[PDB]
C-alpha cells in the first residue's frame, strides 16, 4: 500500500510513513521493483525530514525481515547469543579479542562483520590475512562452529538483510550515508538478523570517527539503543575515543599479530585494553552472564589469565579453516612486508594531534585497503609501534614503524604519517577512552 | 569539477552550485556517466533548497547546450523566430491556430511540442489524428517547411536537449516534477534550443492546471520570463484560466476539428479565442511585428478574416505529409467515433464547478490518452459541445456530447463527466480568461 512514488511524495512533504508503506518500499528494494532513483529520492527525503521512532523501528524491522534471520533456540545452547558492532576506526581490532573473551565466559557470538570502508579497517579483511581463513562458511557449518567454539566471524551472505545491499549501495553514491535513521536501520538490520539476545554498540567519537561531533555520535548511539531494545535485544552503547589509533598497529596482518599478542599477554595496548574490556563487560551484563561490572571484569580477566580466551581464538581460526597451530605459530603464517622501517618526526616534541582519518587513508594508499571494490589488498602493509598522544618523540621514539610492499611505497607512507601528526612543546590534556554508556 | 556525489552533497547542505558544477552534472546525465540515483538525489536537494537565479540560468543553459541547438540566421528569413509554450490543460488547442496566425503575420514558428501527459492533452497527439501528418521530419526538411510555410509543429528528436530526457524521466518517478527551477529548466532547455528571437509562455491557473495555486503559477511564470530574457530571447508570460475546458472540445480529432472551424470562422469558442489572441499578441509585440496591442490585434484579426491563417494551416498540414485538401475536406479524414451521444445532467441548473483534472482523466480512460507510454490512442474519442461555467443545463442543453469507441466505454465516460461537474441554482462569478501578463 502501495505506490513507490506516492510514498516518496508523502515523505517529501513531511508526513510520517506507516509501517505498511515502509515494509512495501523495503520489499520493492529487495525484489528490484523499486529503482535506484526511487531509493535515492526516499533516502534524501529521510535526510531532510528525519524519521520518528515508530518510523525508525519500522525501517529497521523491514530491512531485518527482508532476508534470512538466524535462530539459535533449536541448538539448545546454554548461554546467551550476544554480539558487538563498531562504527569503525583505525586500529579498531577489538572484535578479534572480544569474541573469544566473551565465548570463553559462556556467550555465543555469531559475528557478521564487514570489510574496510573509506578510511577505516575491516575485521573481515584483517582475518583474511590468515591463510585459509574462511569468512563464508555454509549455514550449517556456521551453526556447527558457534555450537562447538562459541564464536565465528563471517561476512554478510546474499540472503542476509538483502534490502540493505541496494539501499547502502545507493546511499554511498548519493550523499545519503550521513543520516541517523538510515545508519541505525542499516546497522541493526544486519545485527538483528543474527537472532541475538544481547548487543553492544561501539560508537566512535573524534577525528577517526564517522559522526562529525560528539553530540551526533551520542544521538546515533541513542537511536541504535532505542531500536534494538524495542526488538527485545538487550542493548547498550559505549561512546569511545578515535582521536588516535586505538591499537598500536593499523593494517591487516599487523593487527592480527597485535590481537594474538594481546590474548597471550605478550603486549596489551592500554587504551585498546580499556575499550575491549568495557565492551566485553556490556556483553556479559546484558547477556546475564554477570550481575555487575566488577564480576564481569573478574570473569574476563580470568579467561585472559588462564589462556582460555587465546585457546578459543585458536579454535575459531582452526574451525574457519585457518591453521590448527595459528596462535603458537602465527609468525610463519602472517605475511611479512618487503620493507619495514621506522618513520621519525622532523622535530622533537610531544605527540599532540593525530588526524586519524588521514592515517587510515595512508594505509589505504599503501595498498592495505581499497579505493574501489575490485582493489586487491596487500595484507602485510601498515603501521606498528604507533606513537600515542602525549608520547615524547625523538631519535629514540619514532612516530610509527611502517611496513611497506616496496621502497617507493614506504616514502609515500612516511610523508603521510608525518603530515597527519602534530607535535607540541607540551603533552595534550588526557581524554577518556570511554566517554559514556547509553542504555535503554 | 567534478564529482557527482560531491555536487549532490554541496547542494544537500544548502550551498549554491557553480556554473561549472552544474554543467559537469548535466553533461554526466547526457553521457550516462551519472546514475539514476544521482539524478534523483540532486533533484530532491533542489526540491528542498531551491535554486538562486544564477543557478536556474546555469541549469537551463547547460540543458539547452546538451544537444542540438537550431540556428535560423543562415536562411536569411525576413521575420522573427518566435514560439509559444503552454503548461498544458484540457481543450488547450491554441497552438493549432496560433502557429498559423502568427506565421500569416510574418513570424517563423519552429514549434517543438509534446504528447499528452497525466491528465492533459498533447498537441502532437492531436496532430497525429490527421492521416499522414509527420511530427518527425528530418532536419533539412524541417528547415524547408519553416522557410516555405512559416510554421511546423514537431516532436523532440533524440538530439534535442538530451539531458532533459533522463532528467524528466527520473523526476516523473521520484516526486521531483513539482519544482519551479526544474520545470523552468526543462521547459526552456527545449524551447531555447529552437534558436528563438521571442517566446510567449502560457502558464495555466486553476483545477486543470499543474501548479496548485495562483501564486505558484505566478512564481513559475516569473522564473521562466527571467531565465529566457537573460538568454536574449524576448519573453513574456500570460497566466490563463484552466477552471474549465478551454475549447468546446477535448480529445484529438475533435480538437483538430475545432481548430479548423475556428480558422475558417464557422465557430469560435470565445474563451479559446481570447486566450489564443492574447498569446498571439505577445508574440507579435515581442517579435517586433507590431508596436502595440491594438496594432497586433488588427493584424491577427485580418489574417483570420481574409482566410490567410486557415491557408497557412492547410499548407503546414500538407508540408508535414497530411492531405493537401485537409482544410476543405477534414470531415472525411478525421476519424469518427463508434458512438456519439449527449450526456445530460441529472438535475436542472447552472454549471457551477468543473473539475478539469477529472475531465482530462475521463478522456484518458476513454482511450483518448495514455496511462503508460506504450498505450495506443483512439483518435476519435473525447468530448464536444462542452457546457461552460454559467450555462443553464436541462433537457435541451447537455453537459457534453461524448464520442466513444463502443457503448460500454460511453457509459463510463458519462458517469465521469457527471461526477466532475457541479450544478448550482445561480451562475458562478465571472473570472478573467487572462489573469495577468508577466514581462522582464
Ligand atoms: N557511524 N556511522 N556511519 C558509518 C557506518 F555506520 C555506515 N554504514 C556502514 C556500512 C553499512 O552497511 N551501512 C551503514 O550505514 O556508513 C558510515 C561509513 O562507514
Ligand atoms: N507547470 N508545470 N509542470 C508540468 C510541466 F511543465 C512539467 N514538464 C513537462 C514536460 C517536460 O518535459 N518537462 C517538464 O518539466 O511537468 C508538469 C506536468 O506536465
From Swiss-Prot, chains A, B:
The protein's annotated pathway: Pyrimidine metabolism; dTMP biosynthesis via salvage pathway; dTMP from thymine: step 1/2
Reaction catalysed by this enzyme: thymidine + phosphate = 2-deoxy-alpha-D-ribose 1-phosphate + thymine
Cellular-component GO terms for this entry: cytosol; membrane
Domain of life: Bacteria
Keywords: Glycosyltransferase, Transferase
UniProt-listed Enzyme Commission number(s): 2.4.2.4
One GO MF term attached to the UniProt entry: thymidine phosphorylase activity
Gene Ontology biological process terms, A to Z: DNA damage response; pyrimidine nucleobase metabolic process; pyrimidine nucleoside metabolic process; thymidine metabolic process
Keyword 4Fe-4S: no
Protein role: The enzymes which catalyze the reversible phosphorolysis of pyrimidine nucleosides are involved in the degradation of these compounds and in their utilization as carbon and energy sources, or in the rescue of pyrimidine bases for nucleotide synthesis.
Subunit structure: Homodimer.
Family statement drawn from the similarity comment of this UniProt entry: Belongs to the thymidine/pyrimidine-nucleoside phosphorylase family.
Protein name, UniProt field: Thymidine phosphorylase
Source species of the chain: Escherichia coli (strain K12)
Amino acid at each position: 500500500l502501495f505506490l513507490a512514488q506516492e510514498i516518496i511524495r508523502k515523505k517529501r512533504d513531511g508526513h510520517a510513513l506507516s509501517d505498511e508503506e515502509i515494509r512495501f518500499f523495503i520489499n520493492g528494494i529487495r525484489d528490484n521493483t523499486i529503482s535506484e532513483g526511487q531509493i535515492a529520492a526516499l533516502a534524501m527525503t529521510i535526510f531532510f525530514h528525519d524519521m520518528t521512532m515508530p518510523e525508525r523501528v519500522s525501517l529497521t524491522m523491514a530491512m531485518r525481515d527482508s532476508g534470512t534471520v538466524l535462530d539459535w533456540k533449536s541448538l539448545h545452547l546454554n548461554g546467551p547469543i550476544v554480539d558487538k558492532h563498531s562504527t569503525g576506526g583505525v586500529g579498531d581490532v577489538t572484535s578479534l579479542m572480544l569474541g573469544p573473551m566473551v565465548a570463553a565466559c559462556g556467550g555465543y557470538i555469531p559475528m557478521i562483520s564487514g570489510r574496510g570502508l573509506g578510511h577505516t579497517g575491516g575485521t573481515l579483511d584483517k582475518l583474511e590475512s590468515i591463510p585459509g581463513f574462511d569468512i563464508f562458511p555454509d549455514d550449517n557449518r556456521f551453526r556447527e562452529i558457534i555450537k562447538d567454539v562459541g564464536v565465528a566471524i563471517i561476512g554478510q551472505t546474499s540472503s542476509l538483510a538483502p534490502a540493505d545491499k541496494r539501499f547502502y549501495a545507493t546511499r554511498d553514491i548519493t550523499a545519503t550515508v550521513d543520516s541517523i535513521p538510515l545508519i541505525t536501520a542499516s546497522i541493526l538490520a544486519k545485527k538483528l538478523a543474527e537472532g541475538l539476545d544481547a548487543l553492544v554498540m561501539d560508537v566512535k567519537v573524534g577525528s577517526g570517527a564517522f559522526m562529525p561531533t560528539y553530540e551526533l555520535s551520542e544521538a546515533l548511539a541513542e537511536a541504535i539503543v532505542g531500536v534494538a531494545n524495542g526488538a527485545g535485544v538487550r542493548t547498550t552503547a559505549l561512546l569511545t575515543d578515535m582521536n588516535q589509533v586505538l591499537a598500536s598497529s593499523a593494517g591487516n596482518a599487523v593487527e592480527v599479530r597485535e590481537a594474538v599478542q594481546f590474548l597471550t599477554g605478550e603486549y596489551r595496548n592500554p587504551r585498546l585494553f580499556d575499550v575491549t574490556m568495557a565492551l566485553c563487560v556490556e556483553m556479559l551484563i546484558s547477556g546475564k552472564l554477570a550481575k555487575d561490572d566488577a564480576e564481569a571484569r573478574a570473569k574476563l580477566q580470568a579467561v585472559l589469565d588462564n589462556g582460555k580466551a587465546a585457546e578459543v581464538f585458536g579454535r575459531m581460526v582452526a574451525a574457519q579453516k585457518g591453521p590448527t597451530d595459528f596462535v603458537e605459530n602465527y609468525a610463519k603464517y602472517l605475511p611479512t612486508a618487503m620493507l619495514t622501517k621506522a618513520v621519525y618526526a622532523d622535530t622533537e616534541g610531544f605527540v599532540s594531534e593525530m588526524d586519524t582519518r588521514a592515517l587510515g587513508m595512508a594505509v589505504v594508499a599503501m595498498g592495505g585497503g581499497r579505493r574501489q571494490a575490485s582493489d586487491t589488498i596487500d595484507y602485510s602493509v601498515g603501521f606498528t609501534d604507533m606513537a600515542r598522544l602525549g608520547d615524547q618523540v625523538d631519535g629514540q621514539r619514532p612516530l610509527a614503524v611502517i611496513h611497506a610492499k616496496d621502497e617507493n611505497n614506504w616514502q609515500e607512507a612516511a610523508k603521510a604519517v608525518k603530515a597527519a601528526i602534530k607535535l607540541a612543546d607540551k603533552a595534550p590534556e588526557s581524554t577518556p577512552t570511554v566517554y559514556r554508556r547509553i542504555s535503554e
